[PDB]
Amino acid sequence: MNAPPAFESFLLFEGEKKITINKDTKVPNACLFTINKEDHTLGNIIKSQLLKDPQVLFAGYKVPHPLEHKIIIRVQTTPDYSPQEAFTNAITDLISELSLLEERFRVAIKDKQEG
Amino acid sequence: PVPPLSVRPAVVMQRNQDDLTHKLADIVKINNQLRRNEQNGAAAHVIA
């Protein structure tokens, strides 16, 4: 009866936030992004896309507990540059990658069908 | 000394008395018997 329900992995409770931002006090230009109801599916591609940016000095993610549904992404960028704009540039590049991939996939599907 | 009800509680219809209460019943039974028997009869063998 202590089983949590299956929807709890992906549904935000009332009053929860999808995303939370906290500045990292130990070093300058570093920030921690806490995402609720996400997992490795999103954090791994976000980390790998952040690591293509040379202005990003540190980037990593973790799940604090598997039974919990949270993910933490720590980003540190060079001064003149913000981890927040680094994050949103990684998102808007990764969406561009997926859109290009989708277009080329459907074109190759049509070409496989009698071509 | 006979101990009180808290020492030998009686449960309700499994009332069922304690294992100690039945022994106390045997005590007062043979005590009343020996008392009246030595009082009237004084057989001096039954008393043994």
Next chain:
Amino acid sequence: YNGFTGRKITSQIFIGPTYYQRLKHMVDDKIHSRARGPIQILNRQPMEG
């Protein structure tokens, strides 16, 4: 291959069909707690079970 990162594991993993059993010792037949529940009759200590 790793299910999280996709990188293949450096060691190679031993894997195959093996006949497992399910024993009757669940956890839901064993979990129990207490906070000032019922009380024994003769001495006023808690119950057992």
Next chain:
RNA sequence: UAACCGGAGAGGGAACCCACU
């Protein structure tokens, strides 16, 4: 110049067997 309701800690024991770490 108006309108109906109401009560709560129960509940025993001994013996034997099986099983768990």
